[PDB]
Amino acid sequence: DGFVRTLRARPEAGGKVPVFVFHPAGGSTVVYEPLLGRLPADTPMYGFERVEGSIEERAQQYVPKLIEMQGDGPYVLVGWSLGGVLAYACAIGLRRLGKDVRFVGLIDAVRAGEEIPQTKEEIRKRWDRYAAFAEKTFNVTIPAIPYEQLEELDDEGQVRFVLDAVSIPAGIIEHQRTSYLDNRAIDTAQIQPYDGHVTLYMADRYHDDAIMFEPRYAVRQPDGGWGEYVSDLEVVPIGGEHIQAIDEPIIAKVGEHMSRALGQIEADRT
């Protein structure tokens, strides 16, 4: 219904605390089905799908829905990839409104090892990189990039400008557009500090295609970039690559750890 997917519905009344999961870059919350199978029986789960805007603007849409569904709390918020950033943003908004947030789970939602500057120089370097790949892939020499026109466009306007040159089945255009926009959303996220507990499940590395797009993701800090914003930070190493973190077998380890946290939350209510 709308942007909320029901993965496992909560009972008519009572029951366990729901897990709210948030979509990853370029995908939907169906990716959380393996995690769900590794959580306690009868754990409700609701997935928040894509909405438009900056991270804060998206959280402004999610947070009223979170409160409509769960009221005062307790809130358990989880996400892989972009979803981790969205969950974190929702935790800050809920906490601001005095709601009880008991768990924020970031599944390999790791910041770039060096801050990604949001400057005209970086816009130029980014698009020079993209053009070079376009030339080796589509086997076409590409002329001078109109830097002045690009540098005054939002990310959404930049892809519109790109679709023009191209002039693709609508389905392929929608997937590339939303994946590009969701990834840029990760790049430009401005993280605010959070004073609750955050659990970061950390893989060993980003995938090669990710690193080719933005080489700053080739390096990971021990705290995944979150320690300066989060004082109460716990990191759970899971190994492997980012893309595998959401799936079996690695998700079993995320799920075992998260199940224990949920059990404690349940005991603290009871």
* Cα separations in angstroms, 70 against 28, 92, 95, 254, 267: 22, 16, 14, 24, 18
Do 199 and 104 contact (CB within 8 A), yes or no?
Answer: yes
- Note the residues at the interface with ligand I28 (CB under 6 A): 26, 176, 179-180, 183-184, 186-187, 206, 209-210, 213-214, 217
**CB of 169: closest distance to ligand I28 in angstroms?**
15
Question: Which residue's CB is nearer to ligand I28, number 24 or number 255?
Answer: 24
Do 194 and 230 contact (CB within 8 A), yes or no?
Answer: yes
Q: Is 247 helix (H, G, I), strand (E, B) or coil?
A: coil
Q: Across-strand partners of 5? A: 47
Question: Which residue's CB is nearer to ligand I28, number 97 or number 212?
Answer: 212
Question: Which residue's CB is nearer to ligand I28, number 82 or number 262?
Answer: 82
- In whole angstroms, give the CA distance from residue 114 to residue 219: 8
**CB of 207: closest distance to ligand I28 in angstroms?**
7
**CB of 197: closest distance to ligand I28 in angstroms?**
23
Question: Which residue's CB is nearer to ligand I28, number 44 or number 224?
Answer: 224
**CB of 142: closest distance to ligand I28 in angstroms?**
18
**CB of 208: closest distance to ligand I28 in angstroms?**
9
How long is the chain? 270
Do 81 and 24 contact (CB within 8 A), yes or no?
Answer: yes
* Cα separations in angstroms, 129 against 117, 135, 136, 145, 208: 16, 10, 11, 11, 15
Question: Which residue's CB is nearer to ligand I28, number 127 or number 206?
Answer: 206
